[PDB]
């Protein structure tokens, strides 16, 4: 109930993959069976640090603010 762990293998569309194994279902989103759990995280590409707020330009694979447009001193 409170997020329990069971079995290592991960079923992805009916495919048995390893935990340490990593599969990329989407070029904008990556998935991995970390700790036997399929943890999907957004695709964060290189960029600045301080910045302001994350924003995806039109349609990319990095829903963050890049380091080029609107840069600080």
Question: Can you tell me about this structure?
Answer:
With 73 residues, the chain is mostly beta strands. Helices cover 0% and strands 25% of the residues. The protein starts with 9 loop residues before the first strand and ends in a 31-residue tail after the last strand. It has a domain at 9-44: Complement Module, domain 1. The chain is elongated, with a radius of gyration of 16 Å. It is built from no helices and five strands. The protein has a three-stranded antiparallel beta sheet, with no helix packed on it. A hairpin with a 5-residue loop joins strand 3 (22-23) and strand 4 (29-34). It is found in: Secreted, Extracellular space, Extracellular matrix. This is Collagen alpha-1(II) chain.
Compile the SSE list and pairings.
Elements: E1 10-11, E2 16-17, E3 22-23, E4 29-34, E5 37-42
Antiparallel strand pairs: 1-2, 3-4, 4-5
Shape: elongated
Q: Measured on Cα atoms, how large is the radius of gyration?
A: 16 Å
Indicate the CATH architecture of one domain: Ribbon
CATH superfamily of one domain: Complement Module, domain 1
Beta-strand share of residues: 15-25%
Broad CATH class of one domain: Mainly Beta
What is the number of helical segments per DSSP (H or I, 4+ residues)? 0
Distance from N terminus to C terminus (CA atoms, Å) equals 50 Å
Strand order of the largest sheet: 3-4-5
CATH topology of one domain: Complement Module, domain 1
Number of strands: 5
Run of helices and strands: EEEEE
Summing up helix and strand content along with how strands pair, one would put the structural category as mainly beta
Main sheet record? 3 strands, antiparallel
Oligomer: monomer
Helix content, binned percent: under 10%
């Amino acid at each position: 109930y409170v997020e329990f762990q069971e079995a290592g293998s991960c079923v992805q569309d009916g495919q048995r993959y390893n935990d340490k194994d990593v599969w990329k279902p989407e070029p904008c989103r990556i998935c991995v069976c970390d700790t036997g759990t399929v943890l999907c995280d957004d695709i964060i590409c290189e960029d600045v640090k301080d910045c302001l707020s994350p924003e995806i330009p039109f349609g990319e694979c990095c829903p963050i603010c890049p380091a080029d447009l609107a840069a600080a001193a």
